[PDB]
Design an enzyme around this catalytic site. Structure first.
Site, PDB file in Angstrom:
ATOM      1  N   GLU A 222      17.028 -19.523  55.758  1.00  0.00           N
ATOM      2  CA  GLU A 222      17.465 -19.073  57.070  1.00  0.00           C
ATOM      3  C   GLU A 222      17.441 -17.566  57.085  1.00  0.00           C
ATOM      4  OE1 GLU A 222      20.752 -21.474  58.970  1.00  0.00           O
ATOM      5  OE2 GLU A 222      21.175 -21.915  56.838  1.00  0.00           O
TER       6      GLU A 222
ATOM      7  N   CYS B 112      20.720 -30.388  62.056  1.00  0.00           N
ATOM      8  CA  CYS B 112      21.347 -29.825  60.869  1.00  0.00           C
ATOM      9  C   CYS B 112      20.963 -30.552  59.597  1.00  0.00           C
ATOM     10  CB  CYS B 112      22.861 -29.840  60.988  1.00  0.00           C
ATOM     11  SG  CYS B 112      23.685 -29.288  59.488  1.00  0.00           S
TER      12      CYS B 112
ATOM     13  N   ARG C 225      24.213 -32.145  56.655  1.00  0.00           N
ATOM     14  CA  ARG C 225      25.144 -33.188  57.099  1.00  0.00           C
ATOM     15  C   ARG C 225      25.847 -33.987  56.000  1.00  0.00           C
ATOM     16  NH1 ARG C 225      21.706 -35.929  61.870  1.00  0.00           N
ATOM     17  NH2 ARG C 225      19.969 -34.825  60.880  1.00  0.00           N
TER      18      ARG C 225
ATOM     19  N   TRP D  15      27.897 -22.845  55.325  1.00  0.00           N
ATOM     20  CA  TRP D  15      27.238 -21.808  54.534  1.00  0.00           C
ATOM     21  C   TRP D  15      25.731 -21.890  54.755  1.00  0.00           C
ATOM     22  CZ3 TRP D  15      30.468 -25.423  51.954  1.00  0.00           C
ATOM     23  CH2 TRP D  15      29.793 -26.527  51.384  1.00  0.00           C
TER      24      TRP D  15
HETATM   25  C1  HEM Z   1      27.778 -26.698  55.275  1.00  0.00           C
HETATM   26  C2  HEM Z   1      26.652 -25.962  55.253  1.00  0.00           C
HETATM   27  C3  HEM Z   1      25.527 -26.135  56.312  1.00  0.00           C
HETATM   28  C4  HEM Z   1      24.225 -25.986  56.106  1.00  0.00           C
HETATM   29  C5  HEM Z   1      23.559 -25.624  54.762  1.00  0.00           C
HETATM   30  C6  HEM Z   1      23.539 -26.246  57.359  1.00  0.00           C
HETATM   31  C7  HEM Z   1      22.186 -26.196  57.574  1.00  0.00           C
HETATM   32  C8  HEM Z   1      21.591 -26.085  58.810  1.00  0.00           C
HETATM   33  C9  HEM Z   1      20.322 -25.435  59.129  1.00  0.00           C
HETATM   34  C10 HEM Z   1      19.382 -24.697  58.135  1.00  0.00           C
HETATM   35  C11 HEM Z   1      20.107 -25.570  60.440  1.00  0.00           C
HETATM   36  C12 HEM Z   1      18.882 -25.008  61.201  1.00  0.00           C
HETATM   37  C13 HEM Z   1      19.261 -23.755  62.005  1.00  0.00           C
HETATM   38  C14 HEM Z   1      18.082 -22.839  62.277  1.00  0.00           C
HETATM   39  O1  HEM Z   1      17.227 -22.661  61.384  1.00  0.00           O
HETATM   40  O2  HEM Z   1      17.969 -22.255  63.382  1.00  0.00           O
HETATM   41  C15 HEM Z   1      21.221 -26.321  60.996  1.00  0.00           C
HETATM   42  C16 HEM Z   1      21.417 -26.692  62.308  1.00  0.00           C
HETATM   43  C17 HEM Z   1      22.598 -27.157  62.878  1.00  0.00           C
HETATM   44  N1  HEM Z   1      23.806 -27.402  62.221  1.00  0.00           N
HETATM   45 FE1  HEM Z   1      24.130 -27.056  60.251  1.00  0.00          FE
HETATM   46  N2  HEM Z   1      24.473 -26.573  58.305  1.00  0.00           N
HETATM   47  C18 HEM Z   1      25.695 -26.480  57.701  1.00  0.00           C
HETATM   48  C19 HEM Z   1      26.885 -26.690  58.309  1.00  0.00           C
HETATM   49  C20 HEM Z   1      27.064 -27.071  59.590  1.00  0.00           C
HETATM   50  C21 HEM Z   1      28.352 -27.230  60.215  1.00  0.00           C
HETATM   51  C22 HEM Z   1      29.722 -26.958  59.540  1.00  0.00           C
HETATM   52  C23 HEM Z   1      28.128 -27.625  61.473  1.00  0.00           C
HETATM   53  C24 HEM Z   1      29.185 -27.923  62.543  1.00  0.00           C
HETATM   54  C25 HEM Z   1      30.476 -27.801  62.223  1.00  0.00           C
HETATM   55  C26 HEM Z   1      26.702 -27.739  61.664  1.00  0.00           C
HETATM   56  C27 HEM Z   1      26.076 -28.147  62.808  1.00  0.00           C
HETATM   57  C28 HEM Z   1      24.771 -27.851  63.110  1.00  0.00           C
HETATM   58  C29 HEM Z   1      24.182 -27.976  64.420  1.00  0.00           C
HETATM   59  C30 HEM Z   1      24.849 -28.456  65.717  1.00  0.00           C
HETATM   60  C31 HEM Z   1      22.746 -27.523  64.272  1.00  0.00           C
HETATM   61  C32 HEM Z   1      21.717 -27.460  65.411  1.00  0.00           C
HETATM   62  C33 HEM Z   1      22.105 -26.228  66.215  1.00  0.00           C
HETATM   63  C34 HEM Z   1      20.957 -25.755  67.072  1.00  0.00           C
HETATM   64  O3  HEM Z   1      20.368 -26.606  67.813  1.00  0.00           O
HETATM   65  O4  HEM Z   1      20.651 -24.520  67.011  1.00  0.00           O
HETATM   66  N3  HEM Z   1      26.076 -27.402  60.483  1.00  0.00           N
HETATM   67  N4  HEM Z   1      22.104 -26.624  59.976  1.00  0.00           N
HETATM   68  C1  LIG Z   2      20.635 -18.479  70.765  1.00  0.00           C
HETATM   69  C2  LIG Z   2      19.820 -19.636  70.229  1.00  0.00           C
HETATM   70  C3  LIG Z   2      19.567 -20.732  71.050  1.00  0.00           C
HETATM   71  C4  LIG Z   2      18.806 -21.792  70.544  1.00  0.00           C
HETATM   72  N1  LIG Z   2      18.546 -22.857  71.336  1.00  0.00           N
HETATM   73  N2  LIG Z   2      18.313 -21.782  69.275  1.00  0.00           N
HETATM   74  C5  LIG Z   2      18.533 -20.727  68.446  1.00  0.00           C
HETATM   75  C6  LIG Z   2      17.971 -20.755  67.023  1.00  0.00           C
HETATM   76  C7  LIG Z   2      18.717 -21.784  66.146  1.00  0.00           C
HETATM   77  C8  LIG Z   2      20.133 -21.351  65.785  1.00  0.00           C
HETATM   78  C9  LIG Z   2      21.013 -21.035  66.813  1.00  0.00           C
HETATM   79  C10 LIG Z   2      22.301 -20.615  66.560  1.00  0.00           C
HETATM   80  N3  LIG Z   2      23.109 -20.310  67.600  1.00  0.00           N
HETATM   81  C11 LIG Z   2      22.737 -20.524  65.249  1.00  0.00           C
HETATM   82  C12 LIG Z   2      21.893 -20.854  64.186  1.00  0.00           C
HETATM   83  C13 LIG Z   2      22.442 -20.736  62.766  1.00  0.00           C
HETATM   84  C14 LIG Z   2      22.367 -22.095  62.096  1.00  0.00           C
HETATM   85  C15 LIG Z   2      23.430 -22.516  61.106  1.00  0.00           C
HETATM   86  C16 LIG Z   2      24.686 -22.970  61.519  1.00  0.00           C
HETATM   87  C17 LIG Z   2      25.613 -23.403  60.571  1.00  0.00           C
HETATM   88  C18 LIG Z   2      26.973 -23.861  60.999  1.00  0.00           C
HETATM   89  C19 LIG Z   2      25.276 -23.392  59.223  1.00  0.00           C
HETATM   90  C20 LIG Z   2      24.009 -22.943  58.842  1.00  0.00           C
HETATM   91  N4  LIG Z   2      23.654 -22.911  57.527  1.00  0.00           N
HETATM   92  N5  LIG Z   2      23.121 -22.526  59.787  1.00  0.00           N
HETATM   93  C21 LIG Z   2      20.580 -21.268  64.463  1.00  0.00           C
HETATM   94  C22 LIG Z   2      19.296 -19.634  68.922  1.00  0.00           C
END
Ligand code: HEM
Ligand SMILES: Cc1cc(N)nc(CCc2cc(N)cc(CCc3cc(C)cc(N)n3)c2)c1
Ligand code: HEM
Ligand SMILES: Cc1cc(N)nc(CCc2cc(N)cc(CCc3cc(C)cc(N)n3)c2)c1
Ligand SMILES: C[C@H](O)[C@H](O)[C@H]1CNc2nc(N)[nH]c(=O)c2N1
Ligand SMILES: C[C@H](O)[C@H](O)[C@H]1CNc2nc(N)[nH]c(=O)c2N1
Ligand SMILES: [Zn+2]
EC number: 1.14.13.39
Lengths: 403, 403
Positions: free
Chosen positions: A284, A107, A110, A279
């Protein structure tokens, strides 16, 4: 130098030594022989994980070694002894939940970790109630476009007893309809899950942006289906600032990015149903969701409108279009007064985040390929930051799809 | 044991069996991934690294077990047994050279690995003679603008004595002159190297694109200054298809990317001076060289000519301008009739390379964060492809700076 990894920033010329990694209690995929850093997917054991989190807690409140610290310890093994599990205290949940977001290598948002609304839902008893709990989340978190980070924690995995599960991967998702020729109408990412709602009695719609219903599953019961009231699902019509035609493409997206299929692990306890929302970052929506060849794929469509030479790569048509598409996402969110953050602002704040964590924990686990944005990579400062990625707990986990 | 490499765009899957031939170590351990670090803070072996290299060669020409193979191996055993080292046959060298490129995990251009002109300079004795080789290599590789990949191989390292090195990181580099204003007229990356030349006798200019002389080093001799005859070096002034003010920026870049600081390992012998050159992929010029904050850094200027809204990030001026600049590069090189490949063409041909090497060897080491280009990542097929990184031999290494 020191025996922990050295961490250069090639732009600024600065160095840091990551000492936090020494806390990792979990192997990743890499070995000295080969690096698997780019792969997307990669009883007594309980007691000692539990002990570990409790020390984290007590240190976070600056009481490490004290009578309440060592009594809560005594208390936790008392519970495990006689039941096999144990329960978190209200504030212990709050800390551990924040700690999981703080610990999430992928993420980029953070810097916001300290400000998050932990919604305790461990009292939840049914799929109906799940839905209600969720409807509250969406309302709070959405806050009419002035978005607010939150997580709703449903109850935790139990011995031989069912899991609480959200079947959908996000709370808000667009349908994806497999066509009788081969194409996909809607979001192709959401084909399977679309196909599952109908199988459980949903009457499908017709369009590129049909909002999906929720498949909620109480322990041991079949999943119950729930339609989100439309008034709840804030969406943003897309339009370009200067290109007047863009608005006519009928494109749109929703405000709330809320992940619902991840596992929240705290001190050995496993919360299989605990959706979190934040948000969006502009890219994205505008680079991943709309331009990925395997998603909405609107790149060629829009380049034609822009009137670009798509017969050849040298025109950088793909590039040009992507930039306008991204810009359309930003402008349109700003205009509808809904929270969003461009890739430049977001990355610049992640730099501040990394600096903050150096001071506080001596490190920050980061997945470089994930932190750096899908366009304009080297234009953001993170592209020039070397990054250590390791697994810390509390954590979020991928988990098998329940069906 | 054998890793499952997936492409997420196509859903296709492979297993990498090639990584098991890796004998060297990387930075990652199962506790933390360091794949993003740019560089690694790092009689009997030679005998086994030779045997095993020689084995590759004979296996590579189908004669594995034959007369010539058996008897060449005994040539080596005998040569290491009396001299502690041995020497390579030119064909063998040509093979190694081609292979080390093939193994370069950070090279997107490896589709070409078979098409490499190899100059045997192992009979070099003076920095004088070096300069003749270096001059001749350039005249060949440049070819009036129709570029052709080449490597020229100066004598191997030897234990009783100092190395043949080229002090320049590249054969062609623009000087970066430091100034009282804390300023840098010219290329900020070449500041240290410009100062060396000065110390060593060269008269400096004061232009933004002053081609630096070469500092050549024969064993245990002081370095020597040789100037490149202006005509050998092909440059390209940059113009722009649509925008007439762009050329008035006086921007320009040289045709030939030729690395001169790296070391070539083959059959466990070390080649300390072994420059090699191919052709530019446009992003190296328009994105990194011209827009890196710590380089020439023209992003703001350009954008202001474009009359964009510099005042805030969400107007996406940094990206908007980046693209024009990349476009300016492609047009200029296509116009001046000089080999160039844009990131779209290239990564496509690399995906083909992965596929070729998949059938041919069962894998291909690749450094994801270096393969994915520095703008429009997600818009290139590589972004979506998982990649395994590991160290195969023959190989290019980094080595210390001679001074
Ligand atoms: C507050 C605004 C936030 C922004 C702008 C943001 C931004 C991002 C982005 C761009 C990604 C990449 C996802 C993708 O492209 O597939 C990401 C991943 C992730 N974020 Fe955030 N995030 C936010 C809030 C949060 C919150 C609130 C949480 C948990 C409460 C969180 C936990 C995570 C986790 C666990 C991942 C990795 C998930 C995965 O492996 O797919 N983020 N974040
Ligand atoms: C099904 C699946 C499995 C896997 N291993 N990887 C993916 C692609 C990454 C991704 C997975 C999920 N579930 C949600 C987001 C939104 C990311 C997000 C979350 C929050 C909380 C804020 C933000 N700005 N963007 C991104 C999909
Ligand atoms: C022929 C056309 C070629 C193209 C388009 C190409 C492309 C590239 C690019 C874009 C990089 C990234 C470097 C950076 O951005 O800093 C790179 C790295 C590299 N390439 Fe190539 N390459 C080509 C030919 C060659 C040749 C001829 C060799 C050797 C004979 C080679 C070996 C390497 C090596 C060893 C690296 C790693 C550089 C480093 O670690 O500093 N490539 N290549
Ligand atoms: C001084 C230095 C040290 C170090 N560890 N890393 C860097 C950055 C990477 C780099 C280094 C060099 N010498 C040349 C290129 C052009 C890459 C290139 C090479 C070839 C052969 C063709 C092509 N198109 N591009 C890139 C610089
Ligand atoms: C720190 C980071 O890994 C570093 O800046 C890398 C990123 N990707 C790159 N990719 C290429 N081709 N060349 C580079 O120099 C870099 N730099
Ligand atoms: C294979 C590669 O790691 C994969 O395509 C990654 C790259 N970076 C990413 N970054 C984000 N935020 N989301 C993604 O799905 C991906 N995909
Ligand atoms: Zn790794």
């Amino acid at each position: 130098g020191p025996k922990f990894p050295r961490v250069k920033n090639w732009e600024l010329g600065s160095i840091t030594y990551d000492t936090l990694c020494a806390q990792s209690q979990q192997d990743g995929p890499c070995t000295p022989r080969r690096c698997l850093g780019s792969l997307v997917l990669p009883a007594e054991q309980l007691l000692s994980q539990a002990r570990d989190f409790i020390n984290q807690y007590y240190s976070s409140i600056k009481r490490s070694g004290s009578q309440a610290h060592e009594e809560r310890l005594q208390e936790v093994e008392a519970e495990v002894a006689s039941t096999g599990t144990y329960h978190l205290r209200e504030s212990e949940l709050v800390f551990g939940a924040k700690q999981a977001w703080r610990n999430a290598p992928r993420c980029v948002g953070r810097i916001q970790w300290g400000k998050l609304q932990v919604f305790d839902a461990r009292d939840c008893s049914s799929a109906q109630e799940m839905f209600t709990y969720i409807c509250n989340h969406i309302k709070y978190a959405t806050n009419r476009g002035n978005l607010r980070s939150a997580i709703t924690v449903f109850p935790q995995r139990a011995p031989g007893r069912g899991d609480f599960r959200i079947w959908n991967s996000q709370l808000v998702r667009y349908a994806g309809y497999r066509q009788q020729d081969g194409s996909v109408r809607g979001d192709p990412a959401n084909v399977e899950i679309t196909e599952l709602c109908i199988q459980h009695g949903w009457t499908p719609g017709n369009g590129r942006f049909d909002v999906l219903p929720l498949l909620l599953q109480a322990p041991d019961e079949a999943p119950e289906l729930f339609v989100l009231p439309p008034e709840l699902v804030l969406e943003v019509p897309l339009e370009h600032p200067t290109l007047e035609w863009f608005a006519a493409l009928g494109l749109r997206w929703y405000a709330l990015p809320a992940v619902s299929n991840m596992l929240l692990e705290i001190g050995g306890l496993e919360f299989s149903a605990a959706p979190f929302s934040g948000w969006y970052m502009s890219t994205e929506i505008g680079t991943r969701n709309l331009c990925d060849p395997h998603r909405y794929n609107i790149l060629e469509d829009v380049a034609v409108c822009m009137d670009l030479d798509t017969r050849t790569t040298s025109s950088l048509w793909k590039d040009k279009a992507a930039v306008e598409i991204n810009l359309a996402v930003l402008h349109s969110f700003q205009l509808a007064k809904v929270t969003i953050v461009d890739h430049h602002a977001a990355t610049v704040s992640f730099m501040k985040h990394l600096d903050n964590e150096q001071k506080a924990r001596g490190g920050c686990p980061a997945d470089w390929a994930w932190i750096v944005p899908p366009i304009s990579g080297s234009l953001t400062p993170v592209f020039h930051q070397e990054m250590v990625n390791y697994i810390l707990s509390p954590a979020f986990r991928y988990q098998p799809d329940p069906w």
